[PDB]
């Protein structure tokens, strides 16, 4: 069973008109809330080790810059260096497990700021490469400035 819910927003067959009450009726009818509970269990979220270390290798200074294999060992020292409590997550053989989703909000926030730090790390080397190009052209033109 793979499964598709369909939600009707209005009765006027319009495009931009949204009604909260009709959709609320259809949330109750279809049972979206009871669909949450079976995937909302004791661990509410999970990943695999390889796109987790691909995902958060920049939050761990041991994995930075590359990479580091094995994936469970780098993910383990990732959660060790970030010192998230051991109650909040769990290790498996082939899956990492996240109990509460607020940790997943926090880690994506910190990753989102490290993207900005990577943009700074790029832009200083690019602009200094332009200044190195200009000083490289002007340096070979004169014996002394």
């Amino acid at each position: 069973p793979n499964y598709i819910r369909c939600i009707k927003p209005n009765d006027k067959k319009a495009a931009h008109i949204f009604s909260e009450s009709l959709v609320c009726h259809q949330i109750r009818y279809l049972g979206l809330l009871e669909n949450v509970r079976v995937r909302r269990a004791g661990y509410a979220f999970r990943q695999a080790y390889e796109p987790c270390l691909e995902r958060y290798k920049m939050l761990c200074k041991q994995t930075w810059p590359h990479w580091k294999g094995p994936a469970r060992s780098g993910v383990e020292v990732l959660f060790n260096e970030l010192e998230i409590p051991v109650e909040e997550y769990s290790f498996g053989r082939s899956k990492i497990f996240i109990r509460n989703p607020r940790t997943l909000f926090q880690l994506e926030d910190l990753r989102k700021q490290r993207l900005e730090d990577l943009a700074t790390l790029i832009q200083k080397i690019y602009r200094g490469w332009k200044c190195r190009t200009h000083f490289l052209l002007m340096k070979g033109l004169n014996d002394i400035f």
Partner: protein, 219 residues
Amino acid sequence: VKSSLLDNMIGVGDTVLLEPLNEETFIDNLKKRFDHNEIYTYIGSVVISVNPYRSLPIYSPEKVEDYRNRNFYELSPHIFALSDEAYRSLRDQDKDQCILITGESGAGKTEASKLVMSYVAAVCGKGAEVNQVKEQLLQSTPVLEAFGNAKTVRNDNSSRFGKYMDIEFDFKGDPLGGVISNYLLEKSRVVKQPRGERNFHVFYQLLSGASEELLHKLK
């Protein structure tokens, strides 16, 4: 693959990740995502669609190749990721699949079944032998919805029976066919309409659409 669901996210793309869980914040989520014109939101591995009543360019064949054999969680929510997870669970792991599509009449179920049929007929790559089956189902849909569907109190047209479609493949991937299977015909609507409702459409199309020699022929 490093890309995830959490990039390009308006609101939250999953109800599982929703803090405090009620009806009201979920209405906030659907109103935010629908007003920002993102109409798909998951519950675990469950698609939620909201009908926008108009065309969006997420069904272009260029957009199909964005989704093909990318994993389920790796990208923004859309109906093709479920059919890709089912198609990879069938193709690589040999597990027969079925997609149950439920919701309000007018909420976009039949169209979604058409889009899953078109997506599978695209990604199998078997040409006219799968496009004969697809053409058969797509050109057979207004027939079945003319016979077995009728007006209710709430809607102008409503699914009064379950359409089913078998999509049958070889081990090699060659299309062996498919079977429409009807379920649960509301029979007493034929003989007794409720107040404000309507009997099945083929009688009204038969009386209103025919010529006078056909009505005098059918007595």
